[PDB]
Write a protein that binds this ligand. Structure first.
Ligand SMILES: *[C@@H]1O[C@H](CO[C@@H]2O[C@@H](C)[C@@H](O)[C@@H](O)[C@@H]2O)[C@@H](O[C@@H]2O[C@H](CO)[C@@H](O)[C@H](O)[C@H]2NC(C)=O)[C@H](O)[C@H]1NC(C)=O
Ligand SMILES: *[C@@H]1O[C@H](CO)[C@@H](O)[C@H](O)[C@H]1NC(C)=O
Lengths: 107, 126, 119
């Protein structure tokens, strides 16, 4: 699972974080989820099942998927959003397991 | 409020062993699958293992498979992880997290982590 | 794929109720009852659509059953599970259907209930 090392943009702008896998990971499995980790803290679930959003999460966060690449789009970028965003998915290769992407640092 | 509290972290020598555990509260322990995830300092997240509510379905990452043993006591709302023959490469912060998918009989492969504990650091060195 | 069921209270009358939680389907010498296993072995099972009668070298599950899922989205009861045997190249066992719904969280072994039944 491949992610951008870092993304950035002006406040108020919409930033898209890509997550590229393969057919056995992202393409054939709409189980992609995204987690926001603040420094020194445990990660929070932001998006699951590609686009679904947990209660308590702001509506500025939305997910999408096409081909073998999943994306997290953050609208109305706030300073508060600075965090490491991890892409998680199920991989059916060999023995069933779950993986995370490298993690994208949002500034 | 849903909470998970990890305990049993600390410093160990390579080749040794360490038991981690976390207590659950705020939800029905026996209704959810609980996963362990580790994060090496300066690195991203890596899934370690998972144990289903019945304890019948247990999965391990290949990197720990054969060394780690996971078990849960539903009566005590307590999850334990026994790490044997550990190495310097296993230094990481370990978290226990609640699987948001309460219906593993429908989509066992579909995993999300709704709640995370604070995490506990395990350091392997001397 | 076979699965062993758990979370069952321990205590001819056979019950499959959930208030105490029971699901009696031992090996003996709402349409919950679906069929029987006898024993090569004979399988007589009434699935959601057709009655199936087969004789084969079955490798039966230690705890065989069928399952019906309740979809709250359309209030539809649909048969989704058939976990009787892994292969099919004096004693018998009764095949009962399980109910699974949003009210039965857990995994394949514990995430279930049962409609009132007896035999
Ligand atoms: C399902 O259960 C069977 C039977 O195992 C017994 O009942 C279980 C609920 C539990 O109480 C076991 O300890 C009991 O022994 C399992 O078949 C046995 O599996 C073990 C390995 O765990 C093996 O050593 C035995 O030889 C197996 N028994 C036979 C007759 O082969 C089965 O693995 C369980 N899992 C499935 C497939 O649902
Ligand atoms: C009911 O909804 C479920 C979930 O979307 C679907 O899988 C099932 O096929 C639907 N059944 C009917 C009769 O619409």
């Amino acid at each position: 699972v491949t992610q951008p090392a870092s993304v950035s943009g002006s406040p108020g702008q919409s930033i898209t974080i890509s997550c590229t896998g393969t057919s056995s990971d992202v393409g054939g499995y709409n189980y992609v989820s995204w987690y926001q980790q603040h420094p020194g803290k445990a990660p929070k679930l932001m998006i699951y099942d590609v686009s679904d959003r947990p209660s308590g999460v702001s509506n500025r966060f939305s997910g999408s998927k096409s081909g073998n690449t999943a994306s997290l789009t953050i609208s109305g970028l706030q300073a508060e959003d600075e965090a490491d965003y991890y892409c998680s998915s199920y991989t059916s290769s060999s023995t069933p397991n779950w993986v995370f992407g490298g993690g994208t640092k949002l500034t | 409020e849903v909470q998970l509290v990890e305990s049993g972290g600390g410093l160990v020598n390579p080749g040794g062993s360490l038991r981690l555990s976390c207590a659950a509260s705020g939800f029905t322990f026996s209704d959810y699958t609980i996963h362990w995830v580790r994060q090496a300092p300066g690195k991203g997240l890596e899934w370690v293992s998972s144990i289903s509510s019945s304890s019948n379905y247990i999965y391990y990452a290949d990197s720990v498979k054969g060394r780690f043993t996971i078990s849960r006591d539903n009566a005590k709302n307590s999850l334990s992880l026994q790490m044997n023959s550990l190495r310097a490469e296993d230094t990481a912060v370990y978290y226990c997290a609640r699987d948001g998918n309460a219906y593993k009989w429908l989509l066992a492969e579909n995993v999300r982590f709704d709640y995370w504990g604070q995490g506990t650091l395990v350091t392997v060195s001397s | 794929q076979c699965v062993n069921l758990t979370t069952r209270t321990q205590l001819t009358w056979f019950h499959a109720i959930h208030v105490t939680k029971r699901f009696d389907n031992p090996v003996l010498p709402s349409n919950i009852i679906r069929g029987w296993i006898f024993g090569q072995s004979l399988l007589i099972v009434n699935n959601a659509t057709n009655v199936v009668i087969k004789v084969c070298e079955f490798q039966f599950c230690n705890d065989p059953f069928l399952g019906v899922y309740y979809h709250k989205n359309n209030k539809s009861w649909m048969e989704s599970e058939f976990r009787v045997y892994s292969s099919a190249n004096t004693r018998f066992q009764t095949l009962l259907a399980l109910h699974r719904s949003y009210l039965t969280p857990g995994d394949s072994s514990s995430g279930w209930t049962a409609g009132a039944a007896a035999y």
